[PDB]
Amino acid sequence: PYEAPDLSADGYALGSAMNNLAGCVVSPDVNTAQFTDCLLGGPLGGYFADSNAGFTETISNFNPKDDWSRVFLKSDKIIPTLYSNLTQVKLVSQNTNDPVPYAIAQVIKVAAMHRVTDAFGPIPYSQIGANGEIATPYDSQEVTYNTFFDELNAAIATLNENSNEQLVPTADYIYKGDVKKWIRFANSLKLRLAIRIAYANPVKAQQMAEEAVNPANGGVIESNADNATWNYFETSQNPIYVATRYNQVQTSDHGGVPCLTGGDTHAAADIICYMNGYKDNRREKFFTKSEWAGQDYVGMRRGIVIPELKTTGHKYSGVNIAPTSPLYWMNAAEVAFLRAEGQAVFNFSMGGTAESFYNQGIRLSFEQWGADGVEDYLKDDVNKPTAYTDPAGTNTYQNALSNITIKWNDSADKEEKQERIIVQKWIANWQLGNEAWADFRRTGYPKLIPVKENKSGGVVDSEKGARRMPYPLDEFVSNKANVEYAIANYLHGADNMATDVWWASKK
Amino acid sequence: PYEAPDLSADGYALGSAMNNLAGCVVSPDVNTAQFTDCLLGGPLGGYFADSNAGFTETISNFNPKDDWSRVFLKSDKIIPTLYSNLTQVKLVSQNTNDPVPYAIAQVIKVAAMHRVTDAFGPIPYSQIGANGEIATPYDSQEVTYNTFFDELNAAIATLNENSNEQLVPTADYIYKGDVKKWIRFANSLKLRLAIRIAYANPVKAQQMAEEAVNPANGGVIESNADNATWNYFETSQNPIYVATRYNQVQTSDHGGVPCLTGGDTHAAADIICYMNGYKDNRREKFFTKSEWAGQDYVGMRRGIVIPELKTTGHKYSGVNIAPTSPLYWMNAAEVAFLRAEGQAVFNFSMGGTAESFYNQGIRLSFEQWGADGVEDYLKDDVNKPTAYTDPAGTNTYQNALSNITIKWNDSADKEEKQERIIVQKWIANWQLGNEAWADFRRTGYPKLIPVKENKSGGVVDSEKGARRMPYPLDEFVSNKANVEYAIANYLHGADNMATDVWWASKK
Ligand SMILES: [Zn+2]
Ligand SMILES: [Zn+2]
């Protein structure tokens, strides 16, 4: 039946706030998402390559300007937006005697903020102000992670208790206000963060992980239908799409044929080397074809002298994404691969065999992307990642990136089991650069092509890569005593890109 | 069931094109919509008032710069966008042996383009190029209108024949691809254009109007569920919202309380005078409260020395619209009032008594906006529009705008019947400024407050107001022979704002 507008229902005020919160994970603001996800996460995670020759100072070359590296902490579109809206939702939940919106808001808060600590290490968190003021004492990263678990646990408790209630759908382009899906996502995120800390605090990691997958707490994401995917662009412009297409070559400058590969960002060589080697049917779903003769898929190397787009850059495979594409937060495949690693590498009780979880992860990913042939792929014990023959001949890498094969081997050593899991988890997490970067730092997988053009002045290792972002210069201006205290006490290393964050403590 | 992305379905290419077409009626581009609908249609239609004191050259004061008046013809977001996408849809329909998308596209084309001729009079139309090139011979407005009817008729024929088919829903935020709704809208638009020409060609008008409401052709919009409303902003920013809020006063500059009335555009005095007088329960739905003591609703006068927003402008009632609000094209109320006028004023066979259509229009409008009290309103034969006592004391108008009462009087003279119909039609069409402006030019109703600050140098009459926009200056540069020919032969008057367009020929 026809329903009149009612700006007054508010209802309306709530919707604005909840949608604003969701925008704090991956920003709908193009320039913000460009920094956090196209220029930081994508390249550092082995997915994307910078492809504007004018970008002479980059994160991927390890000489970023403050204005590139700082964004997660300094963008008013992130922390101030998150906290201001949190404050409003908390008040709505109180006023309406309905705890559901604030509970979901707390899940979104962790989804947004773990990305921030994962980038810098110690950050302001527990003491952040009502309006997202970060001119406060820092938490150690360990304390931050502890707080994340507490917040998720509280949210999960509230949602479970209100499992029959709902959020108005117009307030939620992830799950349309479905409380049970939010519970699954919250537990899934809890699992992500548990495996993150598996080296740093194995006791806590095991406890959190086993709680996450325990039916008594409402379960994890086990189906693509339940992916944490932000479908907020059906009537506008996906920011990764816009940002990757910035400066794309015009048809009239491309022989009268459109160029489909994008502009400022292309697909990375690394992921394409693996997927080409593996004859992976997901390729056509992830990437645009290259314009290089006889090669359907070839990525641009990360950490090079970036070529001119107009001459050669435009020929490399691009990111296969549309204006109406959603933004991913977390998928079912990742949950399966977390359980696989939990069991195989850390001997956690994940609810099934590691082999079963690994295979299911791959099946979930093929299903997610509509790719056929998963059953033959799963059993492939022959095909290996390729080396990187640059069609331009400038940036060739002579070595196969790894010799790791797809088929599960239950008699493999832990190190090999971990590599296999992370390689497939990484493929499945295409576009979630920040997550890939975190996993690479924690595990050392996948093995990537080392940086060639390392602009760090010897500070950053070409293989180990960027371990973190340096602290924003403004911290030393507006928050000096507090950032200095964090450097001295919580960072456990110099304030530069070579220092590992706390959870990155694998032997 | 879970469905994978498939950018390849195209399917996808079609969706982009169809959504692009819809954007050519009222643009989602904020600055474009600001010009066509906030600064042109809204004020000229008696709905909105310009409220930036820096706007010293305006359409509403009758001294517009070329860059304000030209937009409908010169914006690349309108004609070039429309035609380029039309060309693509035509090819898709051919290639897929499916005529439905092009048929709907033709309805959108007329919806977009009638606004353009209605603004200027003679325009390029029949000869416009594949890419929306307007450097071509002009049509007379009569020829343009003839072409509109032919195009609508062809569309309606195709849709009727394919009444059981569908358009993919992601291609259509008006009707979700429902072919029968599109038929109703097409006939409704045909009726709008038929009544438009009721003075200029009564023979044709009657024929088109009676065809439009004939069941054999599939019917008109008779329910709010079937409104031509573009619900394209649930996840972004309605352009009328953004544009009306430009320069809104900041809370810290407003005594620590938010200001809710907007910035660059406020609600007009005229509509509020009628609605206050009529004790109209739709007021709270249309407008924000004013900040003037003891007065819930008071609009800003149009065509004045525009005051400073910060001092007094911000106190006037604003437009009650949200970021997620849709954009209206045509509603059920309008159809009812077209039928009312058709029967009462022109003796067309509309399918019912004029009284019944008038009352139904008012009922539809109350229902549309969720307003109670329509039954008592309908029977009100006492309450009259007010005069305009400016709370600021600067721009007071001492006369009641009209003495016309709400209740239908079937023994009234045609002139009174027309006024009553148009006044209620005008109220019901809140936000559709261009349409109100057209009706005012054709009928002389509603009676408005005459312009006080008339910046036209004596060219434009303060009561009759702007009769058209002058031709864009670029026409004399890129299309000289053709625009001059149109002035000499088709315009039937000087190229200025005082000359009536062809359909505006009431005695
Ligand atoms: Zn190209
Ligand atoms: Zn105010």
Numbering used by the authors:
A (entry chain A), B (entry chain A): 31 to 537
Q: How is this structure described in the published paper?
A:
The crystal structure of the Bacteroides thetaiotaomicron protein BT_3984 was determined to a resolution of 1.7 Å and was the first structure to be determined from the extensive SusD family of polysaccharide-binding proteins. At the time of deposition, BT_3984 was the first structural representative of the PF07980 Pfam family of SusD/RagB homologs and belongs to a PUL with unknown specificity and very limited similarity to the archetypal sus operon. The final model includes one BT_3984 molecule (residues 31–537), one acetate molecule, one zinc ion and 705 water molecules in the asymmetric unit. The partially occupied zinc was tentatively assigned based on electron density, coordination geometry and an X-ray fluorescence excitation scan that showed a small peak above background only for zinc. Structural analysis of BT_3984 revealed two tightly packed sub­domains. The N-terminal region consists of three typical tetratrico­peptide repeats (TPRs) that form an αα right-handed superhelix. A mostly unstructured region of ∼100 residues separates the N-­terminal TPRs from a fourth TPR located in the C-terminal region that continues the superhelix. The C-terminal subdomain (residues 266–552) is characterized by a fourth TPR (helices H19–H20) and by long unstructured stretches that comprise over half the sequence of this domain. However, analytical size-exclusion chromatography, in combination with static light scattering, indicates that BT_3984 is likely to be a monomer. By analogy with the conserved TPRs, we propose that these variable TPRs may be involved in binding to more variable members of the SusD-anchored PULs such as, in the case of BT_3984, a predicted uncharacterized glycosyl hydrolase BT_3985.
SusD is an essential component of the sus operon that defines the paradigm for glycan utilization in dominant members of the human gut microbiota. SusD, in association with SusC, a predicted TonB-dependent β-barrel porin, constitutes the minimal starch-binding unit, with further binding affinity provided by SusE and SusF and starch hydrolysis by the α-amylase SusG. BT_3984 is a member of the Pfam SusD/RagB family (PF07980), which includes starch-utilization protein D (SusD) and the immuno­dominant antigen RagB from Porphyromonas gingivalis (note that previous releases of Pfam mistakenly included a reference to a human Ras-related GTP-binding RagB protein that was corrected in the Pfam v.24 release). The SusD protein family (PF07980) contains over 2000 homologs that are predicted to be involved in nutrient binding and whose presence on the outer membrane predisposes them to be effective antigens.
